[PDB]
Amino acid sequence: KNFSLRIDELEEMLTNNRIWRNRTVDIGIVTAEDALNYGFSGVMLRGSGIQWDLRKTQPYDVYDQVEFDVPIGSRGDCYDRYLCRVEEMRQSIRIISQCLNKMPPGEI
Amino acid sequence: KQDMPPVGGYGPIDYKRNLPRRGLSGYSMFAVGIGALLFGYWSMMKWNRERRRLQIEDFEARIALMP
C-alpha cells in the first residue's frame, strides 16, 4: 500500500526529464521481422510491436483468474521498451492486491 | 487451523500515475522575466549617471590645481 509513491518518484526522475530522454531516443531501432527471426522473447518484443506473451495465452496455475493488462510501447527503440517496465510494475501491485482476497485455507 | 487469509481490510494502493502540480504556465511565464529585467535597467541611469556626476567631480580637482 506504500509502493506506488516510490514508483511515482522515478517518474519525476526520468520520464519528464529531457536529457535522459535525449540520452535514449531512436537508439536500437530493431522492429522488422528479423526482430522475431532472431528469436527474441518479451520486452524487446511486444513493447516493440507484435502483441504476444506467455502470461494469458498459456496458463501456469491459478493465474488466469486475475485481471491485468500488458503494456505496449509505440516504436521499436529502447525508450519504447523502457516504458514497458514502468507499467509492468504498475501491474504487479494490482495482482498482489487481487491475489490476497482469494486464498483459501488448506494443505501444503 | 491457524492459517492466514484475513476476513477484511484492504485498499488497494493505486496503479494511477499523476502529479500535475502546475505551476504558472501559459504566458504567465515570460512576464516575470521581462519586467524584472527592465527593473534592473531601471536601476541603471540613476547610478551610472550619478557616478558620471562624481566622475566630473573627480576630474574637477585635477584641473583646478596644476598651475
Residues A90, A84: Cα–Cα separation, whole Å: 10
- Residues in Cβ contact with A103 at an 8 Å cutoff, skipping those fewer than 6 apart: B4, B5
The data reach a resolution, in angstroms, of 8.3
Q: Cell 524584472 identifies what position?
A: B36
Length of chain B: 67
Closest-CA residue of chain A to B4: A105
CB atoms within 10 A of CB A94: 17
CB contacts, 8 Å: A94 with chain B: 12, 15
Residue B58: alpha-carbon gap to chain centroid = 37
Amino acid, res. A6: R
CB contact, 8 Å: B8 with chain A? Answer: no
Closest CA to A61 of A33, A32, A102, A14: A102
CB contact, 8 Å: A4 with chain B? Answer: yes
Q: Is the CB of residue B12 less than 8 Å from the CB of residue A1?
A: yes
- DSSP conformation class of A100: G
Closest CA to A34 of A54, A20, A14, A49: A49
Does A97 contact B13 at a Cβ distance shorter than 8 Å?
yes
